[PDB]
Structure 1
Amino acid sequence: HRFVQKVEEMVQNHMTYSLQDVGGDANWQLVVEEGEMKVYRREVEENGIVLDPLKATHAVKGVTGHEVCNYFWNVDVRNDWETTIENFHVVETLADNAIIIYQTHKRVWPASQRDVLYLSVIRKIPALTENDPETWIVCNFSVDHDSAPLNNRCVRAKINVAMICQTLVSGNQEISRDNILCKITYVANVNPGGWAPASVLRAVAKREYPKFLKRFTSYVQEKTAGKPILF
């Protein structure tokens, strides 16, 4: 499909940069921590646009990266976990692993409602050799599409989001979910597409990103429990 190059650019970008440790960087703050979940933010505002890069890490017992990415990507289960959208639909299917989605986000007073139009792609990045697990990634990034032009009702946000998952598996007996741990890195770079009250936006992000990570990861745990493990 016509976006194959852009997909590879985004996958490469995230594998090169999004797994780099920000813990030693004075500009990055740990804003929320609960259990194995850590949410970081770097405050960035340019010409009255709040861009605050966000990065979170998590470690989720009993699920694989393939499972986590499938659930994050699969639109059929989206409404079971996502709480920040008013509506969404698939604009176009590009490939078995790549779709273009239009969605509107719930309005947060006093700001105008935002909409977003993004390519969502799920990819397996194999290890150097078969004895190593390596990574599953979902990239959600804004693209242009003639069927979803700008409208006068919503401010068009632009996003670059990735969920990156690595799976740790620890006799001749069957592997148990007790011995699997999924290490998650989640990054979100959102351009709100226009002005917003900075403190209101920042408070919403600080509330909603951890809420999402907790809800979504617990959802994957609930839905995979008892089911055969999809490595």
Structure 2
Amino acid sequence: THRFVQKVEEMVQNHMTYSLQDVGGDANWQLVVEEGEMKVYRREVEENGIVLDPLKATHAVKGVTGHEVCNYFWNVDVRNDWETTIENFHVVETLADNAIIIYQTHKRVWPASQRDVLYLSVIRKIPAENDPETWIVCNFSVDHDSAPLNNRCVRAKINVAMICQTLVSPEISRDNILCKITYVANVNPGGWAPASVLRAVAKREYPKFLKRFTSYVQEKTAGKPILF
């Protein structure tokens, strides 16, 4: 269909192959924050003095499906109900009914300069018979000609996936469904930013995002028919 179909397939397949792997047994991942089933890990990585620290988190959210969690993560129309770090966003291009290109600016965290991002966002169902089906959203930086001029901003590059598998434990009720998330984010912030700032913002904002976002999906879907 669109011009990014092959690249999308490739990003989605790399995440299904690598990002889903369990890291409980992997000492290369540092476990930074645990709050119940919410477990947030990082690797400490710098390229030319820029912090790139890979983020990887798992969570287990009662009462919602993967399909639902991924719709809410992907659907631009509900972005302001859960995002707390975005100043502005514009849909730059609609590629298909499951893929768009988005421009957004993040709120400045003093004393770093503000960051903007230009990324393709795609939502995909990955079919399983002994395995679970998966819903995934991948957001990854692309180049585009309708990129704004924004001289307040350094351009960050991202490769993020929200990957969800759904457990139903034997008319199915929300009480019987559990969504397992794996969330990964590799962000090159560009430019320079104090390493302490980058790291404090990650450490604060990723767990806050995961709590907030997953509670929002629980809240919006409760009392609604289950969308498997």
Same fold (TM over 0.5): yes
Conserved in 2, the CA contact under 8 Å of 1:150 and 1:156?
Answer: no
Structure 2: distance between partners of 1:157 and 1:81: 21
SS at match of 1:6: helix
Q: How far apart are residue 19 of structure 1 and its match?
A: 1.0
SS at match of 1:92: strand
Q: How far apart are residue 141 of structure 1 and its match?
A: 0.1
- Residues 135-159 of structure 1: CA deviation (Å, up to 9, x unaligned): 0000000000001056432100000
Q: Does 2:158 align with 1:159?
A: yes
Relative to 1, partners in 2 of residues 1:132 and 1:45: Cα closer, same or farther, differing over 3 Å? closer
Q: How far apart are residue 131 of structure 1 and its match?
A: 7.3
Structure-1 residue corresponding to 2:100: 99
- Residues 13-51 of structure 1: CA deviation (Å, up to 9, x unaligned): 100100122233333111111021000000001211110
- Residues 66-99 of structure 1: CA deviation (Å, up to 9, x unaligned): 0000000000100000001001110000000000
Q: Any residues of structure 2 matched to 1:70-219 within 5 Å, and which?
A: 70-127=71-128, 133-148=132-147, 151-170=150-169, 174-219=171-216
Q: Which 10-residue stretch deviates more, 147-156 or 73-82? A: 147-156
Structure 2: distance between partners of 1:78 and 1:152: 24
Structure 2: distance between partners of 1:132 and 1:66: 16
Conserved in 2, the CA contact under 8 Å of 1:39 and 1:54?
Answer: yes
Structure 2: distance between partners of 1:36 and 1:25: 17
Structure 2: distance between partners of 1:31 and 1:131: 33
SS at match of 1:214: helix
Structure 2: distance between partners of 1:150 and 1:134: 41
Structure 2: distance between partners of 1:153 and 1:68: 33
Task: Mark the runs of 5 or more structure 1 residues left unpaired by the alignment.
Answer: none
SS at match of 1:160: strand
- Residues 101-135 of structure 1: CA deviation (Å, up to 9, x unaligned): 000000011111000000000000001xx675410
Conserved in 2, the CA contact under 8 Å of 1:105 and 1:114?
Answer: yes
Q: How far apart are residue 63 of structure 1 and its match?
A: 0.3
Structure-1 residue corresponding to 2:17: 16
Structure 2: distance between partners of 1:162 and 1:39: 14
Matched pairs, number: 226
Task: Mark the runs of 5 or more structure 2 residues left unpaired by the alignment.
Answer: none
Q: Runs of 4 or more off by more than 6 Å in structure 1?
A: none
Relative to 1, partners in 2 of residues 1:193 and 1:150: Cα closer, same or farther, differing over 3 Å? farther
**RMSD of the TM alignment (CA)?**
1.2
**Identity percentage of aligned residues:** 100
Q: TM-score, normalised by structure 2?
A: 0.96
